[PDB]
Symmetry: D2
Subunit: 213 residues, 4 copies
Amino acid sequence: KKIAIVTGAGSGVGRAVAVALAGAGYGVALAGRRLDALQETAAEIGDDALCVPTDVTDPDSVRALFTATVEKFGRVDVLFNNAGTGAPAIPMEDLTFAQWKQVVDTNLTGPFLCTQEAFRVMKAQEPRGGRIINNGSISATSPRPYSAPYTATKHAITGLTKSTSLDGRVHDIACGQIDIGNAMDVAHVASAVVYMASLPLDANVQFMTIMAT
Amino acid sequence: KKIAIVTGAGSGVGRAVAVALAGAGYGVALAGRRLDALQETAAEIGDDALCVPTDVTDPDSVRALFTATVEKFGRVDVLFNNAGTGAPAIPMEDLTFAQWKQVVDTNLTGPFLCTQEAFRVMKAQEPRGGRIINNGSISATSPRPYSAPYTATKHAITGLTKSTSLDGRVHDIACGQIDIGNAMDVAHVASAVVYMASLPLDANVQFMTIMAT
Amino acid sequence: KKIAIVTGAGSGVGRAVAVALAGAGYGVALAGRRLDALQETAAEIGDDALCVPTDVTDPDSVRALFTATVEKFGRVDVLFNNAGTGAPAIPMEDLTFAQWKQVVDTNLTGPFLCTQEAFRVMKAQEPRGGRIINNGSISATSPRPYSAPYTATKHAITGLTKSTSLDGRVHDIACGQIDIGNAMDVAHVASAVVYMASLPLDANVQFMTIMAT
Amino acid sequence: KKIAIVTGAGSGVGRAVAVALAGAGYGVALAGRRLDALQETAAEIGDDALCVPTDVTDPDSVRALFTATVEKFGRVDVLFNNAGTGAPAIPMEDLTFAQWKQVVDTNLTGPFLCTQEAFRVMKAQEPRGGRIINNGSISATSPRPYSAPYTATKHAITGLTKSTSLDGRVHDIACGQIDIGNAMDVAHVASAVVYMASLPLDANVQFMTIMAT
Ligand SMILES: [Cl-]
Ligand SMILES: [Cl-]
Ligand SMILES: [Cl-]
Ligand SMILES: [Cl-]
């Protein structure tokens, strides 16, 4: 009955969130670049997860993902906007323009295009609205060496969450963000996302940070 | 089987947290200044909550609360360090020294003394450790007018959480903090605290903020 | 012609700020617990600094400091609210109640009482208003081990600055804060404070952090 | 004798910083898209400013700017990495992919490419190192409505500053950031940048925020 779209759903925290949302009774659309790993996530769910190979850096592929979801399930209540690539851990001035662009497109442009499509879908549905949960950094309180593209784009996600919360309110869209760091088992990020998605629309975890050890 | 001490348990979020922890199967000690309101919380729980009238600004009363808890339940796994008073909303220079001292003692000294006693108890028990959850501000992203004592002491709680996490690690003590603000139903703060207390000791929500509307 | 009160002026950053403000042409009142070290700061200034032994944790002593300043110089344009004591670096639960109270009184109550007296004086003078610069932490981005009283009270100063900025605006009082940390020569904190005090009242450095190395 | 490169130097804060650095005795290279406005900045300086029309979103144009600077002046001690465009204030889902890409390229890719070229130049020169000052947001404590591309990319600049400080240390490169907001005369941002550039390399203002009124 509540419907989620989970990006990066073929691996890691995306897979764990999709499995945990389905266990909590959501209908789930699984978005990611490769069908094989999406299929294994759907097998784990063992219900009616929908696999949707998607390039979230591509506006048309993104639109197609939400259309497929609404066609199958009827609406979209939650988006877990989950991306996380890094460039190689090399001196910053050795990064090529393409290595830079790959991290910006994956970590920042993908989440922004999915947030735009979520606004289009959520504002149109009835009852109106929903929630977007953005997956932030895995090094929250301290950047790793040689990480400027990853650190800049995950900080950009904090700005995107803030503007999405402000701009979503008119459409009954809430937005919050989860970050992790180290002083981690993906199950704990998934249970936190399930918790955040459990709240009614007028209460919202805007930011939370979970620390390992 | 897991044991919690909840301060401010006779009202508001303290009562809601105590009721929610007991519903999740915790043994609960209810600490607060007045027995009457503690009794009503224990009636709501309708199990074996322990009422312990306590002045958390007083070291001996604090020690007595933890001793009563360990005597009854055998150990203390979670402390919800919950205080929240304000001075009158008047020009800052009109505040009397006693009105200032009342907010510092209640909002900062109480939580610090309970954290010290929690370290004494948690480091001594077997298995060792536990978690302390500090209740932060209700105006997280923007201070209200005429609120310097409340705003300074709730910001102090953020510093206390950070030092408690660092200093607790050697004793297997984790510490995290919850804050709220407004762009709220106490049930949502209670379910967030239950969530935070649900995690094993090596994963910890160090900070989370829930926003109304 | 612009007049400053500098607390902790007998040593360290307080002395360096007082010397730098006087070098920039301010009249300076030097506040601190011991006359000897205040005298040496006044000798360094070698002009007309006013030594005022003061206990900033005491409301009457604070009032006396501002009265002495207005008597001598005619008004108070800038307050450098500068305190910074720590408790011993020992396990938190070994701190005595008096060791805790000493850090709260020095690092939080002193600055709050000086801010109240500054509001009384600044709102009354003509032209009205002025600026208060609060000296924050020396470990800004990471607390040291065994530092809960210092870390909680310097975080409290951030809350005090925020409320002082909001509440001061009606009186043409601006408030900002300086913090330092380490990835330091007191001359750099002093030149930053001089910079902050140089701005007209409608532009204000609300926060700045200077990092060593 | 100290040499600065100032981007966006044909207008607004970029022009004011270039004029103020030259007034403080720096040699200045003026980078911006249009020669006309660069010329007017150079006329204001009325000394030996070097105009260098540059597209900072283009790696070759960026390299050419630093090469022109080193050819003329001999080294580069300070970079003011200054960009700031917004997309139209319209519903987020109405933004075209090109309007999004324009803000990411200008506000995030330009500063990243200039930081890479600054590392190449600063690490190679003798004495080695220098400082990079990134111009952050003009709405620091609260995003404006309809501003997700601007808010995300200025938050990204905070991440870039943090990684640049960490990664620059081995090359004696310091990095800090200035932000502004409103509870402003460009002269105050320029005097703050001059202040930040005045410090020796082992002390660094990593972040400062100036608030209007
Ligand atoms: Cl990050
Ligand atoms: Cl607060
Ligand atoms: Cl601190
Ligand atoms: Cl911003």
